[model samples]
Target chain A: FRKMAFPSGKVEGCMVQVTCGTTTLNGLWLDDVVYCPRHVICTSEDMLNPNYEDLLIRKSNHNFLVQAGNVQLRVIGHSMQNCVLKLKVDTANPKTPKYKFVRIQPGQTFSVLACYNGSPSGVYQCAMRPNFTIKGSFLNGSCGSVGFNIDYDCVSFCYMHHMELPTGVHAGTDLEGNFYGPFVDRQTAQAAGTDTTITVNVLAWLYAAVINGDRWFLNRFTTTLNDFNLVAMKYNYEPLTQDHVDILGPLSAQTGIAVLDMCASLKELLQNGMNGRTILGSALLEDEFTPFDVVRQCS
Target chain B: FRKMAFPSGKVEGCMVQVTCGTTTLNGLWLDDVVYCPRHVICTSEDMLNPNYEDLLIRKSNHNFLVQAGNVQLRVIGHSMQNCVLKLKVDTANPKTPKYKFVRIQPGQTFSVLACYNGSPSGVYQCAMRPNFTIKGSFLNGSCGSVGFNIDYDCVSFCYMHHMELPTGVHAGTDLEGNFYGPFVDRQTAQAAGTDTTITVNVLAWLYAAVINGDRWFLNRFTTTLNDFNLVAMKYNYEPLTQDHVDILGPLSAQTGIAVLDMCASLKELLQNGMNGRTILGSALLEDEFTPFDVVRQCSGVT
Candidate 1:
């Protein structure tokens, strides 16, 4: 496989345009016909069969809804150049849109990145149109016999079953420092929307650990969170304020590096006049979607 | 390391009673002196140090509150034939009492079974006296010089941060057969306390997967539960009835073995006139604290 940046753009109907590996293929847009790869043999009737991979790309008004997971795409019987395959392991949970586009050239096969680490795959049944689009160009102004092989899977880790943390519960402070928590589930955590608690910040890394299967990191971080929970429970399950950090004790030593780094990052953020509520929606917490390498290193 | 069952009994301050490996060693009941191991050396001032393992065994009236994990137990220094060391990784959550008693004989180093497989250790800091007691017999009516070796760690997997599943959310069925859910976290799951839902049963396995780090099992079961969630959302999130099971599709094949087994178990339980309320608190769901082995077999399909 040639190492090159995957091209990015939008594909509408039969019209195609993309820059794959320094070559901008545009021109010959197939008219009135949907152009797709023809490698995997499939049929529309297979959608009813549970044993077969079934997928359907439907357009309802302004957007297109693509559903795939055990769902196979009907081969449009055409090959083209400069194709960008759209894939996202939709966890069905609310968060900022994360649609990934991978550049796939003609006569080449590519595997998906997010969910294909030997994990089980399932259809991420959708109630709304996912944010994705593809653009490619044809050479003969018609459908080609050549095809593109794309292997993909979905785990939807963000949408797993999570227990709810209490809302309006305060901790460690004799008085309120201005915010509380609804550390309910992943969906609520991202939607924390100006109400981020210390548990939410701790939860980001905890969720990352859950997705990454880092048991060592998961266990240590969970124990730390449980400690915080203990303190909060002492205060009647109240939302933790900044004072709770002090009560959380010196987390720098045995508390592990990633946690300390997050604590330090949170401290600096607060020192910079930023509050917990604002930080939840900020890049500081969002960028931590993946488990930190320093955490693994410390392990 | 003799292959024998560890003795089970109770231990009081200076009074020990235990039958260790075919020999019921008992007789020396030292008065007013607390008997404990002497291998780990430390003093009372060490409890204030965060770096040092600080453990304090306090008896407040009725029961003894023993705290351990980074906490050092002040040694009284004793050697005896039958000594059963008390250990419990308290996760500080609601559940049935599962106090295990392992008989520790003299000159033997024994490792704890739960929470000691390369996981990080921490003090389980308790608000209540954990259900544990040790009983051993002393020789020559005095504390001995020899000490026991115990290599242990703690990872209270049961108390991890879990998100709350909605209460009263229903799936698959058009009507209610009487139960709803609050699959909120591990505490609530175990505290399900007779209010069981499909998600709670599914969560039992999911929690096991999380504790065991079985990503394959976790992903599959979560996806299946999400599918149920989608159906529940379609009906405005109401509690599911028996009819909902039909709409859940045939879960026997792609759903993996453990899940299928659980579903089969649920079906059998239901057939036996057992309700969801009675089953959540039953031993069936309680026994799934560990990940199933068959889950590893289905990885070939992936």
Candidate 2:
């Protein structure tokens, strides 16, 4: 007779098994007869073949829109208890710009706001804290592409799991994370014109340390300006401009498949800083795309 | 008509008279002006004097001597460097002591010697260094009232003036510029048939810092066992035998005077360690009875 048990419970793609024996047990034989999930099952056999393509997921856009006001911006992330966060707002006018700084705490969410007293057309960029450690990405909201300043749209982005800080160095997820950026860099400021709509994206990701209680939680936040026409002009001679290729390359690669289903379900809750009003009537809110469990998996 | 003239010749301790017009030179009413030596004189009507005996001159003994082995000790009243000289004997019983250090710069003269190999049968006490900044004295030697064993004699002694460390801290001299101590502590080991001998004396009325480039010299090595009979016996009363008092007390007080004078002369040398033997017969040497300069100055022409 044999018996077995599994501890962490099972996911749709995960499995566990156990065995019990009635006869006498010895050390050498026990080692040879039993095996764990990660070990090879046989010389040429495949075990628990998983869908690598569906293992990763992308998050939805939170689409936050606000009229300019005096507001404080706060960011919370794992292992970030002792870090400083700086906020910069670009009203496109160099003579009068507003800036502020806030200290973020570990394992907690932080927010700060300031009055948007500049021209309504000017774009603003907010940089999250813990600058040097983790690369930030946008979960919601929109900005111009690499060089364009068309109808500013929010883009969802996260970092490859391997690029994050070590376990005790930061907080957030051990698997997938976000990357936020290009907030009013020298290139972006150079291309700004009148009536240019600046899109600011808010983002969140897992810092490995926070999950293990060894360090504080750290959340990265930043705003990106997306402009496709400007990007096209910047790379007119090349086969694909940088922003055009980056935005459409991933979508075009997964043809005929549900964009959300093609990747892991964990990405759905990321909330790229896009305005919710734009996507209300599209196939974006359908049941196949709105599986509550799929969203819950990311939560 | 009146006429004035400036002085042309040397003027001794006296006054001068100014003559008016030569012939019949007068206001017709001659005014007599009397002049005396540039002295402050009070009118006899306002004189209220005090007795002179109340300020009598004080006398003191400041000379010291130590004689042992082939070496002789004497005292002089001049700078140690110019007045002192030293001589040595190569082969003497228990090895004739040799001076390890002898620096004779301008005002200093000090030396040390090996008096005996094991035991010396002589009385000895402490002596002041040539300078007033540091007092150099031995616990045992040949001239003191109390006798000590050979081990009590100091084999080496040196005295220097203006010897300061890089930190501006003084290696010698107290804050008041007075020579500190020939501090006599307890003895290490007792003599076979006798106890140790300890003595201390300080110099007064001496300049603490030497003025010239003179140094303190050390020579004439003498080794002996130091005994602290006075302070050590304060509690036990055992070492305070009648013989101990009869010898140590009077001799200690007498040597104290010599220590003071020796320190005064040394202060003028401002140099470091020198040969002690040379200082023994230097110009600053004083006799056993009146070793202090103040004493000699008050006693008229001695």
Candidate 3:
């Protein structure tokens, strides 16, 4: 995987050519405007960053300019809702990807178990968002669990988009509902591209649960915080259900962070590393729910 | 917690006096018949064991005969279905307990969260059964999680009663349904009555789930087997719903144990320690769902 120089220009106006390994992506960005080919890079102001110094590598051959990590995206289906996924690479900027949805009418084969893997690269990355348009649903598996694979060179620069765009950070949205993330840049960097692969998994039952809306990842990330582990008893409702009382009840009880509103948990996790409220340093990495012990213990 | 001698008589006709710590339980048994007190000991033929060597302690003070571990029972309600718990110690045999029926009518307080703890003794023990008579429901918490505490002196002798008694082991039964253990005698011996207490925790969602038929603990115990962790994908349906296909589908796929019927998994786990089918020696332990790694991994697809 070859590294490219970070483009310099207006934050959202920078255009850089991307090669899929040796195969340069097809599509063009003339001036600052997008000639989005049949497929466009999943474009959002969130992808463009002025301070992506962390994603750069210094080369003696070049004058102090750092390189951008190559990017590859993968999609896996546990049991996705019946709809066509619109996610595709910007033909012009194949390095970038975007969401373009297609619908599944009656009697469709439901064949969108597309697994995307890009040529090997430096850092591996992934983003978890919800189905933006009514035509499609987020990759799901209500039967059990599902998986998705995404690869990217630059992880630190990856940003998360929130459902509410006005007060929230930049995001991509459509009809069904909004989604979050590509966030947690620090956590995904540790194991992006090594011998191991990256899989973005979702427990679709939790994903489709009406209570959580589409912030399934956020709900999981927030609830798994060490402080709130036992708080499962406190909420005392449907495990998947979420709302002001359901989400905030435990949030406010465990940490002093002002859970001003429903979305406050995600913002706290993203902006301030959950300010020491969580047990693990990185939210995405931890798996076990209740920690184990040597001597027998009980509830 | 004084130990008593292991009774030596016909396994079906053994009667023993019981004392709760210093307090002798009030009740009487004459001629192998029960004159059950206001609170009768939960009794069954299963309670009488001809070969309970594991529960016997060889004290030099007594002639070659071994002593029965002093018994105490605890009942805890994490969340219980609204009804009066009929579980009471046999007055004559304070060590033994029995289940009686009581109903909770409409607008009832629903306060059956009884936490029973016997005076400290050798082995801590617990038994999980369904609400037998329809008049009452099992200790339940539909809202969320619940807890229950049961104390007993002799754990190894503690036998599990099955719903289908004719073909199954001895069990105390009534209207609502039948329940299984105190059967995993080997597994519970390691931790019962130590500094650590024994708690049988049930996630009510899984408990009330129609598929499980009140076999909540069995489902959890069987599925947690290392062989069946990923099988969650195999039986992929309502996580709680269980039936023949749901239970046997994964059982047959993983181990050579002939799963003859719906209850075969529990029998295999008890009688054979799941015969290397599970990763852990004891099923009650082992928490973390998918094992963790230094890098990354996925689905039990491993």
Reference-based lDDT, each prediction: 0.23, 0.18, 0.20
Residue lDDT tens for model 2, A13-54: 011121112111100001012111111111112113422223
Please name the candidate that would achieve the greatest DockQ relative to the true structure: 1
Docking quality class, candidate 3: incorrect
Name the fnat for model 3. Answer: 0.00
Q: Roughly what TM-score does model 2 have, to 2 decimal places?
A: 0.11
TM-score per candidate, chains pooled: 0.19, 0.11, 0.18
Q: After superposition, how far is residue B49 of candidate 1 from its true place, in Å?
A: 28
Each prediction's DockQ against the real complex: 0.02, 0.00, 0.01
lDDT of 1 by residue, A1-299 (tens): 00111110011111222222222222112222222221112233431231211222321111222222222223232222222122122222122222232332111221111111111111111010011111111111122111111112211111111112233211110001111122211212222233222333243343333333333222222224445555444433223345434433333233444443444343333335332232211223322121222132123
Q: Return whichever of 2 and 3 wins on DockQ.
A: 3
lDDT of 1 by residue, B20-90 (tens): 22222111122222222221122334313312112223211122222222232232332321121221222
Residue runs of model 1 more than 4 Å from their true location after superposition: A1-196, A199-249, A253-299, B1-35, B38-79, B82-302
Candidate 2: list runs displaced more than 4 Å.
A1-299, B1-81, B88-94, B97-99, B102-154, B159-302
Candidate 3 to truth, TM: 0.18
List the candidate 3 regions with Cα displacement exceeding 4 Å: A1-179, A183-299, B1-178, B183-302
Candidate 3 predicts chain B with a TM-score of 0.18
